[PDB]
């Protein structure tokens, strides 16, 4: 339940947060499978709507 976000090559966590209007903590919390050290490009994920 909610909205989905597409992680493209260049999108930053902080940016997406301030953009969508959510907090980085929640953004990652919703998708713990992803890490900052292994930031992949072209991967869809979940986000707060």
Strand-pair category, 43-47 with 3-7? antiparallel
Pick the CATH number of 1-49 from 1.10.10.60, 3.10.350.10, 3.40.50.300, 3.40.630.30: 3.10.350.10
Domain ranges of the chain: 1-49
Only one residue has tokens 């991967």, namely 43
Cβ 20 vs Cβ 46: under 8 Å: no
Distance in angstroms (rounded) separating the CA atoms of residues 48 and 21: 9
Phi, psi of 35 (to 5 degrees): -130, 155
Reading the block at residue 30, the tokens are 């919703």
């Amino acid at each position: 339940m909610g909205c989905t976000y597409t992680i493209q090559p260049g999108d930053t966590f902080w940016a997406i947060a301030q953009r969508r209007g959510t907090t980085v903590d929640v953004i990652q919390s919703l998708n713990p499978g992803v890490v900052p050290t292994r930031l992949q490009v072209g991967q869809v994920i979940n986000v707060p709507c």
